[PDB]
Design a binder for this molecule. Structure first.
Ligand SMILES: [Cl-]
Length: 140
């Protein structure tokens, strides 16, 4: 019963050099990094990634904050990986995010919000496949 979710450490949190602290929150919550790479998404990639929000007001900002610098992309595996990741991340608005979460601690605003996590099983499957061939996802 170990599912997988896609996580991105966004360019604001990479720029702060806290990849390690965030990673440790995943690992101490019993999640395992089974795929990882550092990438700089093109605008096009960010758009396909965020397609589900295309005709939305916050789309422009969400793409441009995702492509402003390098990001750290990983597949996290474990029991209830998707929801555990979401608990660790906290609310999308840091202002309304609980103490001890990744966003409360590292997010500068709604746009510069430190991380992404997949929101359900179907989005997790599609996001993992977007960034990684299974050949490079190592279940352990
Ligand atoms: Cl551009």
């Amino acid at each position: 019963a170990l599912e997988r979710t896609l996580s991105i450490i966004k360019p604001d949190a990479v720029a702060k050099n806290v990849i390690g602290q965030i990673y440790s929150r995943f690992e101490n919550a019993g999640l395992k990094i089974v795929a990882a790479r550092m990438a700089h998404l093109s605008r096009a990639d960010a758009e396909k990634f965020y397609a589900v929000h295309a005709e939305r007001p916050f789309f422009k900002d969400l793409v441009e904050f995702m492509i402003s610098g390098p990001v750290m992309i990983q597949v996290l595996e474990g029991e209830d990986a998707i929801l555990k990741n979401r608990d660790l991340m906290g609310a999308t608005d840091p202002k309304k995010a609980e103490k001890g979460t990744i966003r409360a601690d590292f997010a500068d605003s709604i746009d510069a919000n430190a991380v992404h996590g997949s929101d359900a099983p179907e989005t997790a499957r599609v996001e993992i496949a977007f960034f990684f061939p299974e050949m490079n996802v190592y279940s352990r």
